[PDB]
C-alpha cells in the first residue's frame, strides 16, 4: 500500500533518478548498507516490468542477531551452578562406573601397563597396578568357580570396579576405551541387524516373530533351528540363509569370548554409559549456555587489534567451553573468575597468531608490545623523539635486533591502496615484475646458443666433445676430469690439456668476445 503507491506514483520517472527521496519514505532502521542495492537495481535497466517485479519481491546483521538468541538469559546462581556441576559429576561418575563394569577395559589397561614397564613414581605405578592386577586375578577365579552364585562374587566384581575407579586415566585413554567399546557394540548391532535383515525381509518373517524368538539367547542356534522347525511359511525361506545366520551367531559368540561377558547384558552397560554421556554433555552445554555473558563482556576490552568482534567472542566461547570441562562444584572458587582467565588466555592466544597475514611467535608479539609501551614514555618524559639507539639502550636487547623487529610490524600495506589519485591509481599497479627476463636478453641467449653451437663446429670431435662434456652443455649433467678421462682412455691431465688447447683456439673470433660484455 504505502511503499508501493508512493514508489510507483512518485517515480514517473523522477527524471534524474532522484535517489535521495523515497529512501527516507521507508520504515524500519535506516542508514543501512543493505537496502541500497535493492533500489538502484529496479529504477532503470528493465523498465516498466521491473517496477512490477519490485513489489512482488517486497511483498540483517550478525552481532545483533547473536545478541538476539543470547537474549534468552537463563542465568544461574551459586545454587544453580552447583546443581548443574553436580549433574555433570553424576554423569561422569555413571560413565566411569559403566567403564568399570567392562572387564576388557581393565585387562587392556593391564596389558598396556605391561607395555609401559617393558618400555609419577615408578614404584607407585608398580603399586597401584599391582593392586588392580591382584584384585583382577582374585575376581577372575571367582567366575568359573561359581562359588557364591554371583552374589558375593559380584561383590568382588564391584570391588574390582572400585579399584579401577581409583585410577585417574588420561583423556586419550578414556576416549580410546569408550570408543573401543562403542566399536565393539557396533559389531554387535552389526551382527544383530544382519540377522534381522536376513530373517525378517529376505525370509518374509514378521517383525513380531523375530522379536519373540531372537530376543532370547541371541547367540546359540537354539532359536534358529526352532524357527526353521516351526513349520511356518516363512520358515522354509530360512534354509536359504542358514549359513549367513550361522556365521553371524558364531561371530557374536566370538564377541562373547572376546568380552567374556553375557551377551544379554552388554547392551545394558553400554546403554547406561550412553545415558551418562548424554547427561554430562547436556549439563556442560547448559553451563556454557549460561555463562555466555562473561565472554562478550571481557572480549570487549580486546577489541580492535587485528581481529573482529565475532572472532574474539568466538574464541572466548571456546575458551569458556574449555573452562567448564575442568571444574568441580566441590570447590570454594567460583566460576565467574576461573572461566574468565581461560577466556582471556583463549582469545589472547588467538590474537597473537591468527591476526596478521605473516606468521609471528608469541614472544615476538610480547617484545613488540613491550617496545611500544616503553617507547610511549621516552618522547613524553623528555621532549624530543625517542632515538632508536637510546630506546634500545633501555632494554636487554642490543639494538640491531630491534631494527629487525620493526621489519616485521604491520600487516602491512595492501596493493589496493590509492596513491596518486589519478583515474584511478593503485599501489599494486606500480609494482614491476622482475622474475621475467627482457626479450632482448632472451634473444641474446638464443643467439648465444647458436653462436656456441657454431663455434664448436670449428673444433675436433676429441676436443668439441671435451669442452662440451667438461663444462656440461647440450647434455644436462656435466662431468669432471675423471668421468671424461675414463671414457677417453687417458685420464685427468691429458683431457685437461686438450681442454686448455681449445681455449687457445678462441682468441681470435669476435662472436663470443662481444657476447661477453
Amino acid at each position: 500500500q504505502s511503499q508501493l503507491k508512493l514508489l510507483v506514483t512518485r517515480g514517473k520517472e523522477q527524471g534524474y533518478l532522484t535517489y535521495a527521496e523515497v529512501n527516507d519514505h521507508l520504515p524500519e532502521d535506516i542508514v543501512d548498507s543493505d537496502q541500497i542495492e535493492d533500489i538502484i537495481q529496479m529504477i532503470n535497466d528493465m523498465g516498466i516490468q521491473v517496477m512490477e517485479e519490485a513489489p512482488d519481491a517486497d511483498d540483517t546483521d550478525p552481532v545483533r542477531m547473536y545478541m538476539r538468541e543470547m537474549g534468552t538469559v537463563e542465568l544461574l546462581t551459586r545454587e544453580g551452578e552447583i546443581d548443574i556441576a553436580k549433574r555433570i559429576e553424576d554423569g561422569i561418575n555413571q560413565v566411569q562406573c559403566s567403564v568399570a563394569e567392562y572387564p576388557e577395559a581393565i585387562t587392556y589397561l593391564l596389558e598396556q601397563y605391561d607395555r609401559v614397564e617393558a618400555e609419577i613414581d615408578p614404584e607407585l605405578a608398580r603399586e597401584k597396578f599391582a593392586e588392580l592386577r591382584a584384585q583382577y586375578v582374585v575376581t577372575r577365579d571367582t567366575i568359573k568357580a561359581k562359588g557364591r552364585s554371583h552374589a558375593t562374587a559380584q561383590e568382588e566384581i564391584l570391588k574390582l570396579s572400585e579399584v579401577f575407579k581409583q585410577f585417574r586415566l588420561v583423556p586419550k585413554q578414556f576416549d580410546y576405551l569408550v570408543n573401543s567399546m562403542r566399536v565393539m557394540m557396533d559389531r554387535v548391532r552389526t551382527q544383530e541387524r544382519l540377522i534381522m535383515k536376513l530373517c525378517v525381509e529376505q525370509c518374509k518373517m514378521p517383525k513380531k516373530n523375530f522379536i519373540t524368538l531372537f530376543t532370547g539367547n541371541e547367540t546359540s542356534d537354539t532359536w534358529f533351528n526352532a524357527a526353521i522347525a516351526m513349520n511356518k511359511p516363512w520358515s522354509e525361506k530360512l534354509h536359504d540363509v542358514s549359513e549367513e545366520v550361522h556365521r553371524a551367531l558364531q561371530k557374536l559368540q566370538q564377541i562373547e569370548e572376546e568380552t567374556g561377558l553375557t551377551i544379554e547384558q552388554v547392551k545394558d552397560i553400554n546403554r547406561r554409559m550412553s545415558i551418562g554421556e548424554a547427561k554430562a554433555r547436556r549439563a556442560k552445554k547448559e553451563m556454557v549456555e549460561a555463562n555466555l555473558r562473561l565472554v562478550i563482556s571481557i572480549a570487549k576490552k580486546y577489541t580492535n587489534r587485528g581481529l573482529q568482534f565475532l572472532d574474539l567472542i568466538q574464541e572466548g566461547n571456546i575458551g569458556l567451553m574449555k573452562a567448564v570441562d575442568k571444574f568441580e562444584y566441590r570447590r570454594g572458587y567460583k566460576f565467574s573468575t576461573y572461566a574468565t582467565w581461560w577466556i582471556r588466555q583463549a582469545i589472547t592466544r588467538s590474537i597473537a597468531d591468527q591476526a596478521r597475514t605473516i606468521r609471528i611467535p608469541v614472544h615476538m608479539i610480547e617484545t613488540i608490545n613491550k617496545l611500544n609501551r616503553i617507547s610511549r614514555q621516552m618522547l613524553q618524559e623528555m621532549g624530543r623523539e625517542p632515538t632508536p639507539e637510546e630506546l634500545a639502550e633501555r632494554m636487554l636487547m642490543p639494538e640491531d635486533k630491534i631494527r629487525k623487529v620493526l621489519k616485521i610490524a604491520k600487516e602491512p600495506i595492501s596493493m589496493e591502496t590509492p596513491i596518486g589519485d589519478d583515474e584511478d591509481s593503485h599501489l599494486g599497479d606500480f609494482i614491476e615484475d622482475t622474475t621475467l627476463e627482457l626479450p632482448l636478453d632472451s634473444a641474446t641467449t638464443e643467439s648465444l646458443r647458436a653462436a656456441t653451437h657454431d663455434v664448436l663446429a670449428g673444433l675436433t670431435a676429441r676436443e668439441a666433445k671435451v669442452l662440451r662434456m667438461r663444462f656440461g652443455i647440450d647434455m644436462n649433467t656435466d662431468y669432471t676430469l675423471e668421468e671424461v678421462g675414463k671414457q677417453f682412455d687417458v685420464t685427468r691431465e691429458r683431457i685437461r690439456q686438450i681442454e686448455a688447447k681449445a681455449l687457445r683456439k678462441l682468441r681470435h673470433p669476435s662472436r663470443s668476445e662481444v657476447l661477453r660484455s
Binding site: 527516507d24 519514505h25 521507508l26
Partner: protein, 50 residues
C-alpha cells in the same frame, strides 16, 4: 542529514506538550457557549480573503 521526521517530535523532545506546541505557532480562537448558543471572538482583520 538522515531520514525525515515530523518537525513536532523535536518540540516534544524539548519537553513540550501538544497543547503548548499549538500555542507556539498558531493564534487561538476562543468560543463561548452562553444563553444556549454559540458565540465567537470576531477579529475583522482575520476575515481577509474569505
Amino acid at each position: 542529514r538522515r531520514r525525515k521526521l515530523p518537525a513536532t517530535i523535536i518540540l516534544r523532545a524539548l519537553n513540550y506538550t501538544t497543547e503548548q506546541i499549538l500555542d507556539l505557532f498558531f493564534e487561538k480562537v476562543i468560543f463561548e457557549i452562553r444563553d444556549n448558543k454559540l458565540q465567537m471572538e470576531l477579529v475583522p482583520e482575520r476575515l481577509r480573503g474569505e
